[PDB]
């Protein structure tokens, strides 16, 4: 049942050392590629980063940006990150066997909406295949974009470390859906 896949999927920020077969990632990209999109533009592009030096570069730029973010963060965001024990450290950016970078085509109508919709598909497909992921959004996308020679027509949306999950922390709660009818 799809609800079972969705309910069981949780963030994974800690991965096994072993590298999953690329076929599993490709499968999940093929699932995502079946998603709808504005104008059927299919505005998602994928970059699979496996090179260890490059992952380390990405980790370093993101951690340097997170350090500044964590120094400055305030209020609700700070409290949430503190209560979940987040810090600027992002070891998974180096340790995950794959970094799946997801880009949107700037010129496509509803490109960013469509790519995030497709990311929904992608995440469920990774769960189906027994892989873990976290949608990681660093403070400064441009620095990561430059590291991988991103063309001007593309926009990095999210970094998805992918790998075999390793002793994940539990899924956070979900409040029940409360619907409204006709009008607020």
Ligand X SMILES: Cc1cc2nc3c(=O)[nH]c(=O)nc-3n(C[C@H](O)[C@H](O)[C@H](O)COP(=O)(O)O)c2cc1C
Ligand Y SMILES: N[C@@H](Cc1ccc(O)c(I)c1)C(=O)O
Binding site for ligand Y (CB under 6 A): 38-39, 66, 81, 86, 109-110, 137-138
Site for ligand X, residues 36 to 65, rule: CB under 6 A: 36-40
Bridge partners (DSSP) listed for residue 136: 159
Under rule CB under 5 A, residue 38 binds Cl ion? no
Any idea what the Cα angle at residue 132 is, between residues 74 and 12, rounded to 5°? 30
Under rule CB under 5 A, residue 152 binds Cl ion? no
- Tell me the C-alpha to C-alpha distance, in Å, between residue 72 and each of 66, 82, 88: 10, 13, 12
Q: CB-wise, 91 or 109, nearer to a second copy? A: 109
**H or E element, residue 175:** none
Q: CB-wise, 70 or 110, nearer to a second copy? A: 110
Backbone angles phi, psi at 105, to 5 degrees: -75, 115
| DSSP code, position 77 | H
The response to whether 12 counts as a known ligand-binding position is: yes
Query: Which residue ranges are tagged as binding site for 3-iodo-L-tyrosine?
Result: 39, 66, 70, 90
Residues in contact with Cl ion by the rule CB under 5 A:
11, 13-14, 36, 40, 106, 134, 155, 168-169, 172
């Amino acid at each position: 049942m799809l609800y079972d896949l969705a309910k069981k999927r949780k963030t994974v920020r800690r991965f096994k050392k072993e590298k999953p077969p690329l076929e599993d990632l490709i499968y999940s990209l093929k699932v995502a590629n079946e998603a709808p999109s504005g104008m059927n533009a299919q505005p998602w592009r994928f970059l699979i980063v496996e090179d260890e030096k490059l992952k380390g570069q990405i980790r370093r730029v993101c951690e340097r940006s997170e350090k500044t973010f964590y120094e400055n963060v305030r209020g609700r965001l700070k409290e949430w990150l503190d209560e979940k024990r987040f810090t600027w450290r992002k070891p998974f950016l180096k340790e995950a066997p794959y970094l799946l970078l997801v880009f949107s085509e700037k010129s496509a109508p509803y490109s960013r909406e469509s790519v995030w919709l497709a990311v929904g598909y992608l995440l469920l497909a990774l769960e189906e295949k027994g892989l873990g992921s976290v949608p990681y959004t660093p403070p400064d996308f441009r620095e990561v974009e430059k590291l991988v020679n991103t063309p001007s027509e593309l926009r990095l949306e999210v970094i998805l470390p992918v790998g075999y999950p390793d002793d994940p922390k539990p899924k956070y709660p979900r409040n029940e859906v409360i619907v409204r009818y006709n009008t607020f």
